[PDB]
Write a protein that binds this ligand. Structure first.
Ligand SMILES: *C/C=C(C)/C=C/C=C(C)/C=C/C1=C(C)CCCC1(C)C
Length: 133
């Protein structure tokens, strides 16, 4: 449950629009993003991660080392500077992005061939479920 390697295909996506709105993403682009198929590609070696979420139009890419703070510029999302930090809380992978938005980050629970992802921003939570291909 601590191995997130793989290609992960979306099966569930709840409150995607509320989470994007909390990040101030443009209403027009939110309209397009809600239609796109999302694929999550994770390369994990020890504490080193490369995470890629891909669609037709926009990709989101981030590389990090567990336990090492990094400057993140969310250039393909809301275009903000955050201080990001990914850690293990038991078997949960937790990211906190310190910056303008409060309660901003994400959490991953890996349960066999299922991956549960919760994206948070302010009072909004987006809940996604993926299956390993
Ligand atoms: C562990 C996995 C994480 C943190 C994945 C996060 C995914 C995103 C921030 C993706 C956001 C996207 C949008 C802004 C809309 C269009 C395409 C996406 C899925 C890349």
């Amino acid at each position: 449950t601590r191995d997130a390697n793989g290609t992960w295909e979306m099966e569930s996506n709840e409150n995607f629009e509320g989470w994007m709105k909390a990040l101030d993403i443009d209403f027009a682009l939110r309209k397009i993003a809600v239609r796109l198929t999302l694929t999550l590609v994770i390369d994990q070696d020890g504490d080193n991660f490369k995470v890629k979420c891909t669609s037709t139009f926009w990709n989101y890419d981030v590389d990090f080392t567990v336990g090492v703070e990094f400057d993140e510029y969310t250039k393909s999302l809301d275009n903000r500077h955050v201080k990001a930090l990914v850690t293990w809380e038991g078997d949960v992978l937790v990211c906190v992005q310190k910056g303008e938005k409060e309660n901003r980050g994400w959490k991953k629970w890996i349960e066999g061939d299922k991956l549960y992802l919760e994206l948070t921003c302010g009072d909004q939570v987006c809940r996604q479920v993926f299956k390993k291909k």
